[PDB]
Short mmCIF file of C-alpha atoms in Angstrom, two decimals:
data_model
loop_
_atom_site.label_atom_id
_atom_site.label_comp_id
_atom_site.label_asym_id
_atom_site.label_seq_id
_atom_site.Cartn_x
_atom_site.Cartn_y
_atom_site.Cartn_z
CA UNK A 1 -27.37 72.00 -18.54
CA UNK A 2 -26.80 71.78 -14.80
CA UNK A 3 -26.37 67.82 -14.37
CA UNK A 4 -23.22 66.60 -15.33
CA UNK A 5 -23.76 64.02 -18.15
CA UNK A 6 -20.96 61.27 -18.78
CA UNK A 7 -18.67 62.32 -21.99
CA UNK A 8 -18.49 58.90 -23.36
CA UNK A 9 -22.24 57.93 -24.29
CA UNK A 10 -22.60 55.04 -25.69
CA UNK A 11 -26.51 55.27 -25.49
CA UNK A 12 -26.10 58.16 -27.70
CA UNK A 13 -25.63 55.99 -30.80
CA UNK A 14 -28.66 53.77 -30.09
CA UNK A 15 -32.04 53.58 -31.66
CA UNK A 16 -34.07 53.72 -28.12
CA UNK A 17 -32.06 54.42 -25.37
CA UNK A 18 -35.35 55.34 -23.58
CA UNK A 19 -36.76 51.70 -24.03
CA UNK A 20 -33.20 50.50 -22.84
CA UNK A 21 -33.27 52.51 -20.07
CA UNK A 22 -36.54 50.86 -18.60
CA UNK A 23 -35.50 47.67 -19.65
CA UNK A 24 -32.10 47.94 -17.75
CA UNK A 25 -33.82 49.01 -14.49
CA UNK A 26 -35.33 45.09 -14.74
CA UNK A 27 -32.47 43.08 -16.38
CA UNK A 28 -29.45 45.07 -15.67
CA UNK A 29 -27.84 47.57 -13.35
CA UNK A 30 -29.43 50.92 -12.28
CA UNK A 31 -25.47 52.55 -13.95
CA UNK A 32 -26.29 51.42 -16.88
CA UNK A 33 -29.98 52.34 -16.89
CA UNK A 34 -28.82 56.01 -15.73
CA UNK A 35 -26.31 56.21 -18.38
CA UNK A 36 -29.65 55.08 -20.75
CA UNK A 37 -31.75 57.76 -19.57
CA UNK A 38 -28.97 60.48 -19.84
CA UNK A 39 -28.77 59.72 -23.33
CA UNK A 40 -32.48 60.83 -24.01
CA UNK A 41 -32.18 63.84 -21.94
CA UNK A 42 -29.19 65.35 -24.04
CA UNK A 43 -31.09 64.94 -27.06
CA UNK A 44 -34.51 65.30 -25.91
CA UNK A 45 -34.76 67.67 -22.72
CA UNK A 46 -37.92 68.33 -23.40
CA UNK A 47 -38.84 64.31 -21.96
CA UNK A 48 -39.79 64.80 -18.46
CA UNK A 49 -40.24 61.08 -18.32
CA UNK A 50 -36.55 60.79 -19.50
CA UNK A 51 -35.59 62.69 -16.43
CA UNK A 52 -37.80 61.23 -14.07
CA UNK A 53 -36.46 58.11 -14.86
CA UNK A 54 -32.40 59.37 -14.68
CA UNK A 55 -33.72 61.11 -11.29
CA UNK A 56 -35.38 58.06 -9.39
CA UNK A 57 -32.27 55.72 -10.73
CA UNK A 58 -29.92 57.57 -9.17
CA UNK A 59 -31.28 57.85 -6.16
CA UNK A 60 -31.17 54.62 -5.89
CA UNK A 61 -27.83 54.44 -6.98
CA UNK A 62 -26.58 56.43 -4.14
CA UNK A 63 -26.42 59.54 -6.06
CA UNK A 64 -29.08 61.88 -4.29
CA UNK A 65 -27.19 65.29 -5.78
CA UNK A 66 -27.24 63.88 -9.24
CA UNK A 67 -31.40 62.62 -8.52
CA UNK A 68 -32.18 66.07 -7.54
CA UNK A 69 -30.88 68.06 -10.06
CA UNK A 70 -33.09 65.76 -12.76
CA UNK A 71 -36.12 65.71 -10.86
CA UNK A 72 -35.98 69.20 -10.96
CA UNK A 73 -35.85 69.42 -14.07
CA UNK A 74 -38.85 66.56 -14.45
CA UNK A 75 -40.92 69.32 -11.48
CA UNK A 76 -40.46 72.15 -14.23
CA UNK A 77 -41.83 69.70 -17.14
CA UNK A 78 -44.33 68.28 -15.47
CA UNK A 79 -45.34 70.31 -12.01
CA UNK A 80 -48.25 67.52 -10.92
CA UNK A 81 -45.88 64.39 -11.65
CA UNK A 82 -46.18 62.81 -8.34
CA UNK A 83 -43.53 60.22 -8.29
CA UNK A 84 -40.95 62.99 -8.75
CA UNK A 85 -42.28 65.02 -5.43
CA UNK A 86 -41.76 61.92 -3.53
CA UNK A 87 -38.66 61.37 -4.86
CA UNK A 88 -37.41 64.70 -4.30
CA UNK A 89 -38.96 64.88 -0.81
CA UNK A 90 -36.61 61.75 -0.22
CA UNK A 91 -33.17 62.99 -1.73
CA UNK A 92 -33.67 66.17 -0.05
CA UNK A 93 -34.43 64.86 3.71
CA UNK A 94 -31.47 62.82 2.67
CA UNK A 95 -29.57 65.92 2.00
CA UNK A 96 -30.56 67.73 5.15
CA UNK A 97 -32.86 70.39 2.73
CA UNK A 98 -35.65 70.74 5.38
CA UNK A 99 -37.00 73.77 3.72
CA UNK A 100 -36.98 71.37 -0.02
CA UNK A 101 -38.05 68.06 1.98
CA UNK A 102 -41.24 69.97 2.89
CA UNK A 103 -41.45 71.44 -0.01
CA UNK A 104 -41.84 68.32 -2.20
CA UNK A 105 -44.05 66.41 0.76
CA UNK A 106 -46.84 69.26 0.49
CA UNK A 107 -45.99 69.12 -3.78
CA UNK A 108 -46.92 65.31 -3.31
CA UNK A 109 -49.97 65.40 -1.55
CA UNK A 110 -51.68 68.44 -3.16
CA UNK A 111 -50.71 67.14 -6.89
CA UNK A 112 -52.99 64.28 -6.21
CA UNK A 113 -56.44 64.71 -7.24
CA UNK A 114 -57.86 62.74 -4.66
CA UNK A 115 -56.00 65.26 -2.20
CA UNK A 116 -55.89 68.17 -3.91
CA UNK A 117 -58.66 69.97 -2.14
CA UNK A 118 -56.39 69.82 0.84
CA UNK A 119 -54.93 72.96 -0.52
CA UNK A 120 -57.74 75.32 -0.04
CA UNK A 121 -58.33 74.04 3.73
CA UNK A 122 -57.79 76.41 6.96
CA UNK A 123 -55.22 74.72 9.01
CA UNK A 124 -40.07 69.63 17.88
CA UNK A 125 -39.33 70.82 14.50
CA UNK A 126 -38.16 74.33 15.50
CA UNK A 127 -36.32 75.37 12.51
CA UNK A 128 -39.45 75.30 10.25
CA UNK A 129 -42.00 74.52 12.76
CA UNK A 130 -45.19 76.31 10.79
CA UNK A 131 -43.79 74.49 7.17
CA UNK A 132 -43.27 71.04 9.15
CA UNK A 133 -47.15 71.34 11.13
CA UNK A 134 -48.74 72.20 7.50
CA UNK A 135 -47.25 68.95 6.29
CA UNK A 136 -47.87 66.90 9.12
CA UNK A 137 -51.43 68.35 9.13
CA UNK A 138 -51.96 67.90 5.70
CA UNK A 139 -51.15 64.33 5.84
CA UNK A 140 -53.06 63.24 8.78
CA UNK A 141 -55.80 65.17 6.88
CA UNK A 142 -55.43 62.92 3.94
CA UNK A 143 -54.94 59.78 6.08
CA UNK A 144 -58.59 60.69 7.76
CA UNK A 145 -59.60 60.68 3.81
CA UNK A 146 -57.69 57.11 3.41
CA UNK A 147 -56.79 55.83 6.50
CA UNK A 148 -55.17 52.08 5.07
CA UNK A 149 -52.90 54.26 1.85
CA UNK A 150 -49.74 52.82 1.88
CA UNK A 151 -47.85 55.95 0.14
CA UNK A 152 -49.47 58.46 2.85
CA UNK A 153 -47.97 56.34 5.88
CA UNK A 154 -44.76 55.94 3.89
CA UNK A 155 -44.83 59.92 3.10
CA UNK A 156 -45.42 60.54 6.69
CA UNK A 157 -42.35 57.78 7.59
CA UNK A 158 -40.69 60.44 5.54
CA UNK A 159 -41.63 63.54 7.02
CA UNK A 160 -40.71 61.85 10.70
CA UNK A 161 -37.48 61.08 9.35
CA UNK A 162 -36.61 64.88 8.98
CA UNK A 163 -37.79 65.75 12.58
CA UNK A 164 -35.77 63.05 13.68
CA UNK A 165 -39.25 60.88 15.50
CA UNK A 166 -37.70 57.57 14.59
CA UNK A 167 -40.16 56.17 16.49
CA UNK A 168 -43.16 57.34 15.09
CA UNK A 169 -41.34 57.19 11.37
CA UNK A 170 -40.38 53.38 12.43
CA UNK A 171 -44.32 52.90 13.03
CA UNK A 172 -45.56 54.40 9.72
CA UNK A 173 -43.02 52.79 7.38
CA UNK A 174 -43.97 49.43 9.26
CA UNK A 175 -47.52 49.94 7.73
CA UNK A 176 -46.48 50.97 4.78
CA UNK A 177 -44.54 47.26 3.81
CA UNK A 178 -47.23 45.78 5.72
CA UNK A 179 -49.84 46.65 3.01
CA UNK A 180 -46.95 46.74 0.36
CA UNK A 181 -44.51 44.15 1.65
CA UNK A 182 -42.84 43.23 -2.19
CA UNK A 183 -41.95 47.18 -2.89
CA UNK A 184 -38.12 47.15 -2.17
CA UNK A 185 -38.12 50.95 -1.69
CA UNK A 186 -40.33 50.92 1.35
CA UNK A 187 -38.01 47.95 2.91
CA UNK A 188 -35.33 50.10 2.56
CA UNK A 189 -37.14 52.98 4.11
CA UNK A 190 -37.99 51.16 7.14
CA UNK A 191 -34.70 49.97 7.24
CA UNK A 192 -32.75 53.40 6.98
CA UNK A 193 -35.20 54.70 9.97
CA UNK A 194 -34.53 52.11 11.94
CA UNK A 195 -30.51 52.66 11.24
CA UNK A 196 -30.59 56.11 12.48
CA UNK A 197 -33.01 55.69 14.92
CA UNK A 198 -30.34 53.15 16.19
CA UNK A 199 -32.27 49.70 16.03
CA UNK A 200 -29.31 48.42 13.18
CA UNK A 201 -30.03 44.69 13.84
CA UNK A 202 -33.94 45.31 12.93
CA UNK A 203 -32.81 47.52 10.16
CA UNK A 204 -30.49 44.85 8.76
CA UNK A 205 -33.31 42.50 8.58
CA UNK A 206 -35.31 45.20 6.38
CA UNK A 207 -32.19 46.10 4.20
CA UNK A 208 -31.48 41.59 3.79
CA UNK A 209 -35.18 41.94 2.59
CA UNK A 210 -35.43 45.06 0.09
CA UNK A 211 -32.18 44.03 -1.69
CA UNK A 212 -33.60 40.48 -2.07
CA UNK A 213 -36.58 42.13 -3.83
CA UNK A 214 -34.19 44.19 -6.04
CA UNK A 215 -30.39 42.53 -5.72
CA UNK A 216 -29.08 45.93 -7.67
CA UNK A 217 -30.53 48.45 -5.33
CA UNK A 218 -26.93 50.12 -4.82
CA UNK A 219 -28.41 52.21 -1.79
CA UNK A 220 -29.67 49.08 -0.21
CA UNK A 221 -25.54 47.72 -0.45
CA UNK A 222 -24.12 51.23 1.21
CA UNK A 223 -27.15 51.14 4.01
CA UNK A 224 -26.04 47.72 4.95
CA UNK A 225 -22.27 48.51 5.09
CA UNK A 226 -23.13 51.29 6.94
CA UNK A 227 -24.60 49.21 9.57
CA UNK A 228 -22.42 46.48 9.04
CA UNK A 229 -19.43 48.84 10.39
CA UNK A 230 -21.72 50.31 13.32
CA UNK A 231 -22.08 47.62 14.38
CA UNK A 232 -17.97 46.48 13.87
CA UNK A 233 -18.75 43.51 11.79
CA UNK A 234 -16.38 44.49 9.19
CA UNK A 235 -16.07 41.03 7.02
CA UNK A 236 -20.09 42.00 6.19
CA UNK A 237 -19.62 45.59 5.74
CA UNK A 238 -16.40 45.00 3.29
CA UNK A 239 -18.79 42.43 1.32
CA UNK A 240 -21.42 44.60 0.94
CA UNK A 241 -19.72 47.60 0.03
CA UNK A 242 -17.62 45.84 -3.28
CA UNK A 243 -20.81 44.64 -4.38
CA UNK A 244 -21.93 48.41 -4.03
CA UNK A 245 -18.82 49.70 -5.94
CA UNK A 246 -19.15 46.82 -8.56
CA UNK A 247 -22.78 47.41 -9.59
CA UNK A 248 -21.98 51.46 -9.21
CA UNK A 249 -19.96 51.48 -12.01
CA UNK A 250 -21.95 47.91 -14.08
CA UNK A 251 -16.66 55.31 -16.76
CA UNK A 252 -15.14 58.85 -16.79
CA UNK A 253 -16.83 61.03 -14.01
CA UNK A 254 -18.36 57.71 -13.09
CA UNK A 255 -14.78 56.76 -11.44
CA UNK A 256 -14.57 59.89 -9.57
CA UNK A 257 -18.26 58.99 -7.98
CA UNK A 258 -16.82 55.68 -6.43
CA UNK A 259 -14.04 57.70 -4.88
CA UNK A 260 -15.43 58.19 -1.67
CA UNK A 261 -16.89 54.62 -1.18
CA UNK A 262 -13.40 53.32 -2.04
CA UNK A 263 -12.30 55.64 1.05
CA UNK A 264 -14.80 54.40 2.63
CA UNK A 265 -14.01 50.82 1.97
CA UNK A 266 -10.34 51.46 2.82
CA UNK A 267 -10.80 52.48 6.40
CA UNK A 268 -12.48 49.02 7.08
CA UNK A 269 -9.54 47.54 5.57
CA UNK A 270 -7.36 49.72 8.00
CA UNK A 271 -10.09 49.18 11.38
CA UNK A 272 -9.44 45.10 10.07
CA UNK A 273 -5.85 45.36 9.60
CA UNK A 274 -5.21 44.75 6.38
CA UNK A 275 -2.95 47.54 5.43
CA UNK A 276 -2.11 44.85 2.66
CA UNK A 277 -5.80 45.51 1.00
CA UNK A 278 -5.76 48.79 2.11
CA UNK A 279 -2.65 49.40 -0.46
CA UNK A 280 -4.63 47.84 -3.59
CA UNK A 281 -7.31 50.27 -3.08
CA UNK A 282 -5.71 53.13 -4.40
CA UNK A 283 -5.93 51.11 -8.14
CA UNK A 284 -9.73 50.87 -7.80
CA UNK A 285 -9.85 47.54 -9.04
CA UNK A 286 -12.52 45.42 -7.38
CA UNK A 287 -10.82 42.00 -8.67
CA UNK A 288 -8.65 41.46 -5.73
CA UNK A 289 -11.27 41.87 -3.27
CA UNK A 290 -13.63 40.25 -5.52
CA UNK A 291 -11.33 37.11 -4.69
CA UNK A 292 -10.64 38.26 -1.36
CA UNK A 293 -14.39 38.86 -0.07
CA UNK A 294 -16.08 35.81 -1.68
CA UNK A 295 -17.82 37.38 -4.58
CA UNK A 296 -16.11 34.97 -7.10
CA UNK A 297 -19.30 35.86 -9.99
CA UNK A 298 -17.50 39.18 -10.21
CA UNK A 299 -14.29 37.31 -11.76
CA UNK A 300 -16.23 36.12 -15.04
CA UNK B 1 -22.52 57.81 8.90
CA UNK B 2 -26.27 58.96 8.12
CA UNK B 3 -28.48 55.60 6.43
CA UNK B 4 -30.15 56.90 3.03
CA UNK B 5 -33.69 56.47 2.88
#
């Protein structure tokens, strides 16, 4: 296989790892769930649900490498699964994939069957400008065919989001939590526009309200640290980024992953003068700044 | 540093 499964797999013993897995994404941690989900796809690669699943959990657990290389997987199973477009159009705009993000934007339109029509129709982005028109085309098209669909503003909130039109991305994505205001993906969407399009208080107040929805959305944690230091309020961005690296591991390669959030985390340390704290992170131990940061629940 | 959608 390509994706690099965790040696020590304790779902492997289980009875339903699969039914875990889904369980875990509502009682548990999104690690754990992935870990779950892994455990089917060793022994059953053949499940394109199985790796759906492991892709769209670790995309939300701040692992858009490891999402892409099992929703590809998932796009060979299943070609007209249309969760695992979106989610690849995502990861990949993430990534900086234009060519991909486009890709997996048309992929999730035309794999609808209320859309899928929109295939045989006549028809600054400059790097791709005819692949980046055909999408934007497409999905105005289908937006003229339902003007109030949530998903087509948010897949267009998307597709700005490559191009860089924060604006315009900002605008769609408001529409889309407007009609779906309790989907924590979609807050976080809005919220990660609204970062980069450099509006960070307005995009806190998104990210405050998609982790509320879901308090173990990992990429939610790392969005708001992000800001957090952007905007130098480094007591916030320390909190939020040890409740990152706590749920991100709920071990192996899973301890190399955290690496470069504990780097991360030990530069605000440095900008805050702690060289003190800076020292302890080179044991990767979250106790200490468990105690240190206020997030006590972590001690039990 | 780039915010994740």
């Amino acid at each position: 296989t390509d994706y690099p499964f965790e040696a020590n797999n304790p779902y492997m013993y289980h009875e339903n790892p699969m039914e875990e897995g889904l369980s875990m994404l509502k009682l548990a941690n999104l690690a754990e769930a992935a870990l779950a989900f892994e455990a089917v796809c060793q022994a059953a690669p053949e499940r394109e649900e199985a790796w759906r699943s492991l892709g769209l959990t670790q995309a939300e657990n701040e692992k858009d490498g490891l999402a892409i290389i099992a929703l590809n997987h998932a796009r060979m199973l299943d070609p007209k699964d249309i969760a695992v477009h979106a989610a690849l159009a995502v990861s990949h705009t993430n990534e900086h994939n234009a060519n991909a993000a486009l890709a997996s934007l048309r992929a999730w339109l035309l794999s609808q069957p209320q859309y899928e029509q929109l295939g045989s129709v006549n028809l600054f982005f400059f790097a791709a400008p005819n692949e980046y028109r055909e999408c934007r085309t497409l999905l105005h098209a289908a937006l003229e065919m339902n003007p109030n669909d949530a998903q087509l503003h948010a897949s267009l909130g998307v597709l700005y989001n490559l191009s860089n039109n924060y604006d315009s991305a900002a605008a769609n994505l408001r529409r889309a939590v407007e009609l779906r205001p309790d989907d924590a993906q979609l807050w976080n969407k809005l919220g990660a526009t609204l970062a980069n399009g450099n509006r960070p208080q307005e995009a806190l107040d998104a990210y405050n309200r998609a982790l509320d929805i879901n308090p173990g959305y990992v990429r939610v944690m790392y969005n708001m640290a992000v800001s957090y230091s952007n905007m130098s309020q480094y007591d916030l961005a320390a909190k939020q980024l040890v409740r990152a690296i706590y749920m991100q591991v709920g071990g192996e390669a899973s301890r190399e992953a955290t690496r470069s959030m504990w780097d991360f985390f030990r530069m605000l340390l440095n900008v805050m003068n702690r060289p003190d704290l800076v020292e302890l992170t080179y044991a990767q131990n979250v106790e200490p700044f468990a105690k240190e940061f206020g997030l006590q629940s972590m001690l039990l | 540093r780039a915010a994740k959608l």
